[model samples]
Target: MMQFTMSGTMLRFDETTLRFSFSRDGATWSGCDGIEPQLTREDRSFSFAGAATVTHERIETGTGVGVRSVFAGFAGADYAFETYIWIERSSGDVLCEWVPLRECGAEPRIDRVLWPAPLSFDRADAHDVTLITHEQGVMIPNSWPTEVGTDAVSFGGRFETAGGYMPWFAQLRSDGHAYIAICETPWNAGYDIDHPAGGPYTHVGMWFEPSLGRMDYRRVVRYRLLDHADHTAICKTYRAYVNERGRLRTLAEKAARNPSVRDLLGRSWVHVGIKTNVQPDSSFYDPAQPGKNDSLVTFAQRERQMRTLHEMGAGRLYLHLDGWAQPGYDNGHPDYLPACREAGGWKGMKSLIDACHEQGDLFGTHDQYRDYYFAARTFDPRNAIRLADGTMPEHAMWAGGRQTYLCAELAPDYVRRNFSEIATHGIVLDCAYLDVFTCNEGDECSHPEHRMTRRECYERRAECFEYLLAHGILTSSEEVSDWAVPSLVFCHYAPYDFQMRSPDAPRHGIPVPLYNLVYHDCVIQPWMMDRVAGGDDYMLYALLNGGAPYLIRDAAYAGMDGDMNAALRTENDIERCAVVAGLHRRVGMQELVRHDLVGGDPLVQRSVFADGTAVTCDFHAQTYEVAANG
Candidate 1:
């Protein structure tokens, strides 16, 4: 066995396994023990274990000493990868990187490779794991006592997107110590977790996918070993990394570019729909579902609702008006125009916008450019995304009949063209939400005209947001993404994971503000204020995150889309939303400095803002307290 020390951490390696422990301020905690690296290939069903020719060396750098290990050839396969382990001498932060060296044959493809690898602790039942999910983060026991199956909990980044909200997973031990594995370059990475009910241990690891038939880049994952740390500290570590890399951009910065961003803060949001005409040929058109192909609401009715909110003490509001076009809600996008004639045409729509201006309210439209409908007037197969195998993917999942994803390479051109046309029709747009840009994975196109990589696709998508901001329009998307945080001002709803799933489904973990902990000051988030049956009040979430509340949310499709459980159908309590809105106004601009469970109770959490304001929540009692320190 060989041993080395960096900072206050010590690592030991044998022929096929590794172990580590950390120390700080006279206290030492043991980390993972007896962990071995694993690698898998697409053609092979089994994983390759530690190899024979294991070698090691030490290199000195400005920050610390790095221990480099070379595993030549897998246990039984003809592949090798380099593993570099190091700790920042001063900070005791550990980093592990896996670099692939060779391909066994002409047709070898790496399905997944993991390093630092997976280790199970003796106290499996005493561990807590935090997952950064789609919209938020969740915490659960390392060993799921109720789960009993061989199927591993798995999620991945498809189409070069980060697997989840942020590319990180953390574990806190019962001994009051924690470790976080952060995927620094997570474009095409994934994570797999296995924790059986009455199992021997919990196993978690990071998996990287090979692109273009090879692992062309180094997979770097950082581990921040901490003492007395929780999910909040893990998130803050990433936020610090983001800020160090100059990637943390806020609405305040976007406001410097587009002053209208300033008007979006601290306001209650109302999602109002003016039309809903689902085509007969659409996939969602079902005989059993009433109003599947029907239209409802009107610009005049929406105008009156806005007036009522204004009279009911809504100081400032942002109206996200959907289905205001002739083609209706989810139909003929990028070709949508003329404002529903039945809902009172351009004249009536303009009247609504003018009325919003009269009441000092912000107005924007729910616009989409990615979902290219076959019925769209300008739909062209040549402009759709082409796969590496030269096939265009078409689906009938949406309400616009058969559709294919639009090549993001051409999205900016459509955004400019459509927004310009809307301007020509005399619509004043203060903000514009590009649907599903951030919520879903990025696209990859191989068409001859638009041969684009996934990274290029995200850049082109950002170009669309840039165009909107350049025109003084605040940009929004369906959800938050690190790539879009630089330009995004707001999202449809950055809600908890349980909010999207069925109310009866078992929660994977406790809801935590992992995304908001990183991007709260960077972007504005609107939260749902619904009071679901047998569930905690969502208004407390809005307060906990210091986000704008949705005063009135009318989903376009009932039992479909964002508000799946109809939890948002609660009565429009104007006064309730205003209470949350007032808190938003008080602390929207301040940074979230800390968030922790009060007295170590998961149901009782507290959030402290930089502006000397604190909000404490009691989930069991469904009550909250807000205070300010002068």
Candidate 2:
């Protein structure tokens, strides 16, 4: 066991279990005996639910600094643990948590949540400090201690008061078979602090907490269970908010700084399936091939789809031609025209573009030139600059391919030609969705042409982005990209806003999105609600969170059947569409940035605008407690 003194008190630790307990009043905080965990400066680890859960660790403070870690799981009936910190603060108390941001190896983790500068008072000063998770995922002090307490500070003496708050960062893994909801009441120092009429509310941060270490902070909070059977029930409870802190810089500002881009604000456009009437389908879809049974025949069907959306209050609708690039899901040929001729040669392309223009809308294709990096079908091997005959470079994708698609670095020329031809499609592309642009499978592009390093391969592709933008076209990709962070400021951000696979898909859905919420203030196209997968229709849910709708036709395709088509064709449907349409009008191409993100419930993410417009999306469907002016 190692011993360290704080405020002249000795705190001992067991070296094996990496566990430590605070001692004050000459007594130790530890009750149960567990193996003392190790304390290290820096390391990496992986295991969602295991004895060793954390990977990277770093801590900085005034008195004395020591790393902190957690040994627990993020799922199951007993998803909880204790923090192991080596405190350095001699006179003042030290603060730490098993925060996900710090564990991810990303920098400025401290800035993700808002915190007051260090206090300068003595122990006897007796000032109050309340921790709050504000809009934008920030955990801050509602009020900081004005005068430092001169008296000796101990874990029990510091946090034993009535108004103290404790918070933690977390992720809830789902089983696909069920919905999970962890809830907590926004607590204000329950006893010591005086309350206004409405009272100050604290948010729920994790599943449950047993105690708040040696401080007055509540050791633990209750974790609630939500019903998974009803999609609407899940939608209402699980929507999260974007929180803000210093490290969170909006992608819009980045795009604004770029000299070569245009700010297309007050612009109205739509996102729809290109060939098929939904999110672009691939050959892997149940059955391969384009058109066939799912095909939208004639110009009328496509045009009708456009008109219906317009009636739904949409100004311009982007026809995302799915099965066009890959093999359509039905009984159509995969060998369609190249990127340039896919829409029916150049002549047919002109007609569609002209049609959009006639209807006062812009036409954009769901083109992913960089997406086929591991493509098994639409690949042109000769286009690949032979990296050794058989082993072409590829990026492992969440989609399913195991190896080489196409190496953009090795075949920049091929990539260039592909986009150039698509540019010739006659439609003025509003923007194109470049899905997973940075992903290169196994980092194995050894082609002589691809002489640059893997990360540089991304930069080389920037040349294509510049070329595309120069040609009066715009670009958008699937997830947050180091390069496209600024690009999202002006373009549409996608399905990344919500869980891609399941609307409530656990850690990646909430935790990862929370990680990105700080870095991007660009548009977030909340998950795919266009179908049953997104769970009960909930455009209003995302809208309240400042999310732009990424509507695909899967819910109501251009060729919707019977009653479904009849319902969409109705007059009231247009007005109902305004719920989302109105939000787009209100936000108008603004990025959904975070405001505060700590102490509150982990599932309750809230946001506030400069105009005094504030919105909160709580994974738990209760009227969340939010302070208006504190």
Candidate 3:
């Protein structure tokens, strides 16, 4: 443990899990009784001093409230004390006029990711650390001296005179051992909303264990009661909050917004496949062919299309939605519209779903829920996962806030509202392809709605799963959700954003894309872009996995081939029509596909149909073959 003092405030430190406590009158008497807070050590590629600041203030949150002093002094054990004053909270619970304490100013470097300008600090041994500069949000680093060796802790330099509410970490590193971080920031503090603190009195986690066979990431925060002054204890809290909560929340929300079984279960009686382009405003209309527009083909068209394919013995038909359903087109119910508040307005979405049923085609949406800019009254932001700054994260959206993702950890109202949206949608949604799920992290900011530790992140996400499975939705989310989630999710969508390449584009692998689904339970929609209407071969490749085989093609610019063009219209030639009908027969509403292998070097998983036809899905990337005799 390390020790120091400032303004007659004697502080004692513990090195096991770096922390510090308050003392007065030259260490004989204890001035403060509160526990040492948790601080996330900013020591990755860049330090936290670049764009962020840490300070103790009179703040409160909805869950717990208190008047605690924050000490962010983790710069190579040089400084003794730290504090930020002039704190203000709308909550009457904490009304402190001022907090006068010493602040630290470390020489920092440039960090381009989170903050505009960063600060740089140096250790006695000469290693330099970059911190955020106060004057500029992001700028170049030139305020500190250069270090010669890699093994050193950059001190936060000398104490600073100016201060404000922010994020900072206390470092205690002298030579080779890892720098111990000992400080705590408020996530959500206080008991009442009117008198709530920006961050509450919640347990913070620190890195502790590493089970990945020598991958040793011991920066964990297991729940432990330690002296607030002890830095190690505080580190544990940081680990728990960030790892368990933050990490989990992202996964859970993705689970909640997932398309359900009602989405996967087919509603079309005939199950006919097609190579047609469906326009949202008009019928499956082809302009070049003139009079080739098929207006009568609605849900019933599936039955007719399938019958034609059956006669010809073909196995797949590709259907294209021609700018018709407006990818996640938001509905405008006063409670649901204004895209920023809710998951695309629930009311305005009915027309598109009904249209798919009318055509007897499997339904799915070109989803980008993570990038929504709409508002929803029925939407809840509670369990909605939060970023470090307590709000939903918003990036670029095509229609000005048209794109956005919600934090699913805020719970109750948030999860319930989303669940209700799914119920209202009538699950026949075969798939919802989320465009980008893991794009933003670290330096990227989040909305005030999404503010929780990494662990809570997962817990909040898990709740969404409960709701999704109860409704029978086949849950699948884009990107990855560490090992924290359950098997309830039907699969993890991988190699995101398909439709940029052709199926026959000289790809060398043989196991096939669907094999990814057979093993590890992860799903993949290979890029399938037909020049015109859509492609049947693309649909067959998709079907091999026993999942929804979709037809994605660019119909607005490129034109469809003769065979595909006619099949899209009501009047189609015979051969192509026969193929579509055969695939419809092969696919049924109720089914379970499985593999026989337990585990192997190459990881081969096979999918056995109820009728006994099996496809050996080589779990490895780009290599698997269908059993010839099965």
Candidate 4:
């Protein structure tokens, strides 16, 4: 057994049991109480505790202390690695690292490393809360009534996907002590969580996989322990971590470079499309109704709709126009150009953008760079992403008929060529929405010409956004993913996860503005205002989060983006939008200081901003009030 202490914090490790623990402020937390460290090959799993040879030695730390323990001969095989647990005296934080070493040869059969396990908590109480970045966020109490991580499309709780918008998870115990674990290297990692229905225990640990065909780099997870902390404190801790790394780019800083970012605030979003041509092979295609497979709304008609919206006394607005390019909405991406000739070509599209500028409204086009469509004029299979196994992925689920993901390494070049062409046609853009870049996982390409890792994929995606900003165009994506905070100006929707599912489905946990509490002042989010049956008015959520309202969603897929039912759309949308836009004008760029439940009632919530303005929403009565700090 070995132990160390820093600032009254004690860290202990047992060599025999392969167990570690941290205790501070009279609170003790065990890392994997009963669970053992694990590694896996194709069909077999090995435990470090079962290793035939285990040895430890002191390592080097500039102003800190560390240990490097090596384990070999696991399950009668020569699978070996070293684990490091070090205390950084600079910040008094703990860093757990896994280093792959082979004095013999490269280990190709190693598939996963599940060390640096999660801290365990076994007692169940209403005040004991666990936070997961499943979407915007979800706060689950230990005694909550639903099991988690069971969603089929959840991508196995992968990071940088819908499963985790942020790279960290936190816990707040009843005793007011808490901790947050952040993956310093999150490109090829995810969280493994298990919380049974009405459980007495909820365990969440980090997992890592090979980059291309091998685990060649070190994986690190940093742990920060705190006393007298709550959910807000936990979020702030991660925010500070990001800030220290100089990645906390706020809107104030962004506005200094691109002044158009301020114009996006407090403006109502109008999402509409001008063309649709679902291919025969598309899953959304309607074979029974041939007319349903194709449709078009002329650019002239959409321009008139914009005129009508302004004439109806709708306040400042931004129109997110889709399907304005040739080949219709979701087709021929990276080659979608010349504008839709059926909708009057580039001439008509420019006129619509002009009309918007003349009316003091912003205009943007909906485009995609990731989905490499076979229908594209320059479609080439070589440019598409190739997996590590040397095989390309194929799919036909989208309206593009058949497509695969474009290698992100080449995405910036395509973006430059396409947008440069758009400028040559004399069409101005206030913003550009690049679909799926921020909504899905980063791709890893193994093609020799454009060999890329998950980390390089994100860097390439951000380069696309930087290109737009340099050209005076604001940037938007499908979701407000955390990695895009430095470059993304706004998002389509950052609503809670339940909003995307049917409103009537049982909720996984309490809906909270965890993202807003950290990034409200950093990015603009447009939320849905759909009123549901026996549920809180979604407008309340927008007001509580101080986000822009979607005046007209015109969803590409019905019942998918959010719970939108025309049958339940009984209120005047523009009037409700006005209410949300009014509040947004005041707090859109202010920091969200805190969010809380009113009188311990989940139906009633309150949010306070840095300006001392507080908005309280009552879902039961469908009413809200704004109170100034004065």
**Top candidate (lDDT):** 4
Off by over 4 Å in 1: 18-36, 45-58, 61-63, 69-80, 104-108, 122-131, 143-163, 197-201, 288-290, 564-572
Off by over 4 Å in 2: 1-269, 274-304, 307-313, 323-343, 370-403, 424-426, 438-454, 457-464, 481-483, 489-520, 524-537, 555-573, 588-606, 616-630
lDDT of 2 at 139: 22
lDDT of candidate 4 over 223-293, digit per residue (tens): 88888887777888988888899888899999999998889877999999988989998889889987777
Predictions in order: lDDT:
0.74, 0.35, 0.29, 0.85
Candidate 4 off by > 4 Å: 103-108, 150-153, 563-569
Candidate 1 yields a Cα-based lDDT of: 0.74
Model 1, 1-630: lDDT tens digits are 556677777655553445544445344544346454566665653323346566778767888766777767654556676778777777777778787777666244666676556644545553555344445666666555444221323234331232367777776766567767777867667666655654445566777766534676788888776777767777888889888888798667767777777777779888888887776677668766566577678888989988988997877999998888898888897788778899989888899999999999999899998899998987889999987557999887767778899999999989998899888878888899899887776776778799876667778888999898888888889877677887778888777767766676666666778888888888888987778787878888888898989887777766654565743336657778778888888788668888888876779998888887889999999899999972
What is the descending TM-score order?
4, 1, 2, 3
TM-score of 2: 0.50
Q: Rank the candidates by lDDT, best first.
A: 4, 1, 2, 3
In candidate 2, what are the lDDT values of residues 1-630, reduced to their tens digit?
Answer: 666665544445454544444544333334123222221111322223244353324445565655544444332222223453455454323333433322332221111111111111111211111221111222212232221121211111111111111122221112111112112221111111111212121111122111111111322221112222222222222223212212223534445554222233323335544344222332233344444324433333456666676666665344544334433212111122353334354555556667766776655554444444323454555444334223555443222233344455644465466566655665456555454452221122445645333334455556555565556565554333333333343333432322222334221112213322333244434323342232334433444444444444442222221112222111343344444545544553343344333343445555554345555555445333323332
- The lowest-lDDT stretch of 10 consecutive residues in candidate 1 is 148-157
